[PDB]
Design a protein around this ligand. Structure first.
Ligand SMILES: Nc1ncnc2c1ncn2[C@@H]1O[C@H](COP(=O)(O)OP(=O)(O)O)[C@@H](O)[C@H]1O
Ligand SMILES: [Mg+2]
Ligand SMILES: [Zn+2]
Lengths: 159, 210, 528
RNA sequence: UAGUCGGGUGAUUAGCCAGACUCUAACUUAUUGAACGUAUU
C-alpha cells in the first residue's frame, strides 16, 4: 500500500471487475462505486441488494480464483432506519452529506474552547484542519458556525 | 377456491410485447389494483389473506412465452420468492415442488366454477366432489396435488381451525329452522354468508354453512 | 497521544485503556467506571450502563452450512428446527469463540479452543477451510468486537489463520483493571446434552481451590458444568458459616428463644434441652464476641435454587452421620441429591452451577445474579415433564435478568412462553444454503400448543399414520354421499368411532354434530 | 416501545429541547504513500 505505483496498479487490476459488476448493477437499478478495497451498493428498490454478495463471490472467483476474496465479516446492510456512512461521510435522512452529529458537536466544543482562549496551539491547528474538511463536505455547517459564533471569531480563527 | 369475475384489461399490458420484452422490465404496482379488485386481497388458489404475494402466470413463462403479457393468464398468488425462500403451496409449489404436470387439467378459477369439482370437508381436507368420473375427477385430483392444498400443513391447519371455530354457529342456526318462519331464517342465513366474503378460506366456510 | 485523548474523552473505552497503559488516575477511573457504572430500574433490578452481548454470527463452510448469518437478541434467542438442522453446531461455534475471552481473562495471551480439522469443515466445500465470525457489543464506547475462528482441512497445503486479537484486547481490560481494583466479571457457560450424567459424590477432584474466585471459569465451556465443584463449594461455605461464633450465637440465640417459647407453652419435657442450649449460648458469648460474606453467598444460592427448581423447597448440608451430605426437600420429602430423579438432578445441576459462578464473579453487586454474561443451553426441555416446560424459561429469566440466553428446543410447550421475535427458525427444506435465519410468522407467546405444532413445528396435531385419525373425515364423506342419511356403511363407521373413542369422546360429539347438521340441511333441501 | 437522523440550546465531545426516519439489517476506519480540501508560495 505504501508504494506510489500501487494505487494505479490496484485500480487497473480491478478494471474488468468494475466493468462487469457496474453493468450488472445498472440493469437492476443499483448504484455501484469502489473506493480501493471498499465496495458500496445503493438502491431505492427493496430486496435487490441481498443478491449482490453472491454475485460478487462468483465474479471474484471467475476473475481472480482464490487470490481475491470478500471479507464476509465486513459485509453490512443498512437503510434509512439506521446510520448510513460511505467512506467516513454520513448520509443523513434528508439525502444530504453530513459530517455526523457527534463530529459536529465536537467541532463546536473546540470552537467554544478557542472562544475562551483554552485551546492549545496543537488543538488550534487541529481545529483549523477539521474546519477545512468540514467546509468541503458540509459548507452549510460553516455558515451555521459563523451565525452561532460571530463571523469575527471564526475569521480570526481561520486567519 | 372461488369463481373469480375477470372484467377489464389494464392499460400497461397494451405496450409490452412477448419475445422482445421481459417480466423484469414491466412495473408490478401498475397491475396489482385490478387483481385486488378481482380477488379482494385474497389468494386465487388457496384463499389465504395476501401479505407476501406475487403475480403468478397460470401457464408458466418458460413453457408458454406467448402468454406472458396476457390478462387472462395472470393471478395474485400467495408467497414471495424475493423476500423469503421455502414456500410450499399455490404459485411457488406449481413451479418447484409439483413435478411434471399437464397445464390443461387444472381448475382455472376465472374460466371454471371450482364448486362443481372441489368439496371442503369440515374435518379440513379438500377432496373431489361427490360423483366425478374420468376427466373431471382427474382435474379435481390434480388441482389438489399441484397447488398442494392438503399437503401444506400450515394451510391445512389454518383451514381446519377456521371451519371448526364456526361449527357451533352452524349447528345453532339450523336448530332454529323449526321455531322461526322462513322469511326470518332465510334473512339470517343471508346475513351469515354476508360476513364470510370478508373472511379467509371463504369457500371452505361456505360449504360448512350451506 | 492527542488522538487517543480525544477519543477517550469522547467515551471510547479502548483509547482510555491505551492511555492508562502508556502512563504506567483519570484514565483508570474512566475504564473502571465504564465497566462498573449502572442503575437500578423501576423494577428494582440493577442494569449496567454498558451491556455485553453477542450481536451477530456468521458461519462459512462450517459443518452443514455453506454460508449462514444469524442476528441474536440481547436477552433471549431460541433456535428451532428438526434433528440435523445444525442447532447444536451453532451453539458449539459460539462456545468456541467465548473460550478466547475466558482464556485471556485467566492468563495474558491465553489460548482459546479451535475448530476441528477432522470434523468441522463442510464435507463438500470446494475451498477446504471453515470460518466462524462473531461480533460482540460492549456499550456505546465499544460497539464492535469482531472475532474469527478459522481452520483448514487436514492435509491442505494452505493454512487459514484465526483472528482473535480483539477478544484478547477486551479480555485484557477486564483482567488488568480487576488486578488493580476489584470489578464484576462476565459469566460464560455452555450446558449441552452432556450435562445429563449420573451423580457421584464419592468422586472428588483435588485440583484447584474451589473458593478461589477464578475457579468460576473452571471448565465453564466444557458442556456438563461442574456440579461436583458446586457440592464441594457449598459444603465449604457451610463449614465456614457454622464456625463463626456470632452467627452461631445468633442461631443459638434463636434456638434458645424457640425452646423458651415451647417451655412457656407447657412442654416441660424440653426444659432439660433448653438449659443445655442456654449453657452453650453463655459459653459462646463468653468466647470472644464479634457480617460473613460466606453466609450471604450461601443464602443467595439457596434462594436461586429454590426459586428456579419447582420441586425443591429447601437445600442444606448435614454432617451428623459423620460424612458431609447435601440434602434437599423435594415435593415435601427430605432426600439426598442421589435420590432425586434424573430430570430434577440435571436441572438442579444447571441452576446451581450457574448461580455459583455468578456469585463468585459478581462480588460488588447487591444481587450477584444480576451480573452480565452469555449462557448457552442445548435442548432446554431435556428430561422435563410438560408441566415444567411451561415454567422453565420464565424462571431462568427472572433469576438471571442480565444474562443473554441462547437456547435450542424441540418443545412447542416451551415456545408457547416465548415471543416470536426471540425465535429463529430453519426453513423446512433448507439443505445448508439458506443465508439468514428468521422469526416465525405466528405469535407464539400465549398461543395454543396444537397451533404451534402445525404453524411453527410443521407437524399435524393428529398422527396421520394412524387409521383412526381419518375415521371422522371418512364418516363425513359417507354422510355427504348418501344425502345426509345414515346408511348401513355410515352406521358401521359411526359404531366403530363410538366403540373406539367412547360415548363421551370429542370425536363422537363431532360425529353427532355432523349427523344433526346434515339431517337439518337435507330437511331444508326437501322443503325447498 | 426501541433504535437511528439532527436543527437548536448548552465554559459545550455531556445534559436538555424541537422535528423527523423505519428493505430481518452500519460496526467511523489508515501514513511519511496516493488522492482530495486547506495553508504556504
Ligand atoms: N462436516 C460436516 N459436513 C457436512 N455435514 C455435516 C458435517 N458435520 C455435521 N454434518 C451434518 O450436520 C448435522 C449436524 O446436526 P447438529 O448440528 O447436531 O444439529 P441438531 O442439533 O439440530 O440435530 C447432521 O445432519 C450432519 O449430517
Ligand atoms: Mg498526510
Ligand atoms: Zn395461496
Amino acid at each position: 500500500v505504501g508504494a506510489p505505483s500501487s494505487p494505479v496498479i490496484s485500480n487497473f487490476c480491478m478494471y474488468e471487475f468494475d466493468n462487469r459488476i457496474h453493468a450488472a448493477c445498472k440493469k437492476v437499478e443499483i448504484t455501484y462505486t469502489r473506493y480501493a478495497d471498499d465496495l458500496t451498493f445503493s438502491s431505492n428498490i427493496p430486496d435487490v441488494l441481498k443478491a449482490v454478495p453472491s454475485t460478487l463471490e462468483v465474479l471474484l472467483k471467475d476473475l481472480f480464483g482464490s487470490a481475491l476474496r470478500l471479507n464476509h465479516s465486513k459485509t453490512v446492510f443498512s437503510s434509512k432506519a439506521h446510520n448510513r456512512h460511505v467512506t467516513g461521510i454520513t448520509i443523513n435522512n434528508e439525502e444530504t452529506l453530513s459530517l455526523g452529529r457527534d463530529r459536529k458537536r465536537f467541532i463546536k466544543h473546540l470552537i467554544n474552547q478557542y472562544k475562551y482562549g483554552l485551546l492549545d496551539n496543537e488543538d488550534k491547528a487541529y481545529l483549523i484542519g477539521l474546519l477545512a474538511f468540514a467546509s468541503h463536505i458540509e459548507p452549510s455547517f460553516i455558515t451555521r458556525m459563523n451565525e452561532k459564533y460571530s463571523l469575527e471569531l471564526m475569521e480570526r480563527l481561520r486567519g | 377456491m372461488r369463481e373469480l369475475a375477470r372484467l377489464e384489461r389494464p392499460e400497461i399490458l397494451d405496450q409490452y410485447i412477448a419475445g422482445q420484452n421481459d417480466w423484469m422490465e414491466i412495473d408490478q404496482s401498475a397491475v396489482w389494483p385490478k387483481l385486488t379488485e378481482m380477488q379482494g386481497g385474497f389468494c386465487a388458489y388457496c384463499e389465504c389473506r395476501l401479505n407476501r404475494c406475487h403475480i403468478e402466470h397460470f401457464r408458466p413463462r418458460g413453457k408458454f412465452p406467448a402468454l406472458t403479457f396476457i390478462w387472462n393468464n395472470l393471478f395474485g398468488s400467495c408467497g414471495d420468492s424475493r423476500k423469503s425462500g421455502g414456500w410450499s403451496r399455490c404459485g411457488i409449489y406449481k413451479d418447484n415442488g409439483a413435478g411434471a404436470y399437464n397445464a390443461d387439467d387444472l381448475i382455472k378459477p376465472d374460466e371454471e366454477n371450482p364448486d362443481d369439482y372441489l368439496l371442503f370437508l369440515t374435518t379440513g381436507e379438500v377432496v373431489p366432489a361427490i360423483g366425478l368420473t374420468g376427466r373431471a375427477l382427474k382435474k379435481a385430483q390434480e388441482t389438489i396435488r399441484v397447488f398442494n392444498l392438503n399437503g401444506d400443513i400450515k394451510l391445512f391447519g389454518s383451514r381446519r381451525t377456521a371451519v371448526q371455530a364456526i361449527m357451533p354457529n352452524v349447528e345453532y342456526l339450523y336448530t332454529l329452522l323449526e321455531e322461526f318462519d322462513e322469511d326470518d331464517w332465510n334473512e339470517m342465513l343471508r346475513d351469515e354468508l354476508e360476513k364470510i366474503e370478508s373472511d379467509e378460506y371463504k369457500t371452505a366456510l361456505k360449504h360448512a354453512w350451506t | 497521544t492527542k488522538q487517543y485523548e480525544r477519543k477517550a474523552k469522547g467515551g471510547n473505552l479502548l483509547s482510555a485503556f491505551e492511555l492508562y497503559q502508556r502512563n504506567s488516575g483519570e484514565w483508570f477511573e474512566m475504564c473502571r467506571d465504564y465497566i462498573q457504572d449502572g442503575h437500578v430500574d423501576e423494577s428494582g433490578i440493577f442494569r449496567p450502563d454498558n451491556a455485553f452481548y453477542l450481536r451477530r454470527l456468521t458461519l462459512k463452510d462450517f459443518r452443514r452450512f455453506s454460508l449462514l448469518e444469524i442476528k441474536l437478541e440481547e436477552d433471549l434467542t431460541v433456535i428451532i428446527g428438526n434433528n440435523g438442522k445444525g442447532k447444536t453446531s451453532i451453539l458449539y461455534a459460539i462456545a468456541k469463540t467465548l473460550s478466547w475471552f475466558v482464556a485471556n481473562i485467566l492468563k495474558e495471551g491465553g489460548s482459546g479452543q479451535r475448530l476441528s480439522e477432522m470434523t468441522d469443515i463442510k464435507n463438500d466445500a470446494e475451498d477446504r477451510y471453515s470460518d466462524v465470525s462473531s461480533t460482540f457489543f460492549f456499550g456505546k464506547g465499544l460497539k464492535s468486537v469482531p472475532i474469527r475462528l478459522s481452520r483448514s482441512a487436514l492435509g491442505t497445503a494452505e493454512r487459514r489463520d484465526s483472528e482473535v486479537k480483539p477478544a484478547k484486547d477486551l479480555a485484557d481490560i477486564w483482567r488488568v483493571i480487576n488486578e488493580v481494583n476489584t470489578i464484576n466479571l462476565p459469566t460464560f457457560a455452555l450446558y449441552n446434552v452432556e450435562r445429563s450424567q449420573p451423580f457421584n459424590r464419592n468422586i472428588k477432584d483435588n485440583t484447584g481451590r474451589r473458593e478461589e474466585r477464578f475457579d468460576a471459569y473452571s471448565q465453564t465451556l466444557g458442556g456438563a458444568g461442574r456440579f461436583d465443584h458446586f457440592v464441594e463449594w457449598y459444603i465449604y461455605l457451610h463449614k465456614r458459616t457454622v464456625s463463626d461464633i456470632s452467627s452461631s450465637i445468633k442461631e443459638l440465640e434463636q434456638q434458645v428463644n424457640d425452646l423458651q417459647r415451647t417451655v412457656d407453652g407447657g412442654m416441660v419435657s424440653v426444659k432439660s434441652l433448653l438449659e443445655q442450649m442456654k449453657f452453650k449460648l453463655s459459653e459462646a458469648i463468653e468466647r470472644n464476641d464479634a457480617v460473613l460474606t460466606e453466609s450471604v453467598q450461601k443464602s443467595i444460592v439457596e434462594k436461586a435454587i429454590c426459586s428456579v427448581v419447582p420441586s425443591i423447597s429447601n437445600i442444606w448440608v448435614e454432617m451428623i452421620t459423620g460424612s458431609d451430605l447435601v440434602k434437599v426437600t423435594n415435593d415435601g420429602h427430605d432426600v439426598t441429591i442421589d435420590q432425586l430423579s434424573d430430570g430434577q438432578r440435571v436441572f438442579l445441576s444447571l441452576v446451581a452451577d450457574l448461580a455459583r459462578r455468578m456469585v463468585m464473579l459478581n462480588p460488588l453487586l447487591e444481587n450477584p445474579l444480576e451480573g452480565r454474561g452469555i449462557v448457552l443451553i442445548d435442548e432446554i426441555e431435556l428430561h422435563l415433564h410438560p408441566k415444567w416446560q411451561q415454567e422453565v424459561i420464565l424462571n431462568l429469566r427472572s433469576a438471571f435478568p442480565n444474562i443473554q440466553f441462547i437456547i435450542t428446543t424441540h418443545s412447542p410447550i416451551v415456545l408457547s412462553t416465548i415471543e416470536k421475535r426471540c425465535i429463529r427458525e430453519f426453513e423446512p427444506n433448507d439443505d445448508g444454503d439458506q443465508s439468514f435465519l428468521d422469526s416465525p410468522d405466528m405469535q407464539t407467546k400465549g398461543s395454543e400448543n396444537a397451533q404451534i405444532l402445525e404453524q411453527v413445528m410443521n407437524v399435524h396435531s393428529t398422527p396421520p399414520g394412524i387409521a383412526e385419525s381419518h375415521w371422522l373425515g371418512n364418516f363425513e364423506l359417507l354422510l355427504l354421499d348418501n344425502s345426509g342419511e345414515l346408511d348401513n356403511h355410515s352406521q358401521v363407521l359411526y359404531d366403530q368411532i363410538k366403540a373406539h373413542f367412547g360415548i363421551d369422546s370429542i370425536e363422537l360429539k363431532k360425529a353427532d354434530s355432523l349427523i344433526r347438521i346434515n339431517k337439518m340441511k337435507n330437511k331444508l333441501n326437501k322443503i325447498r
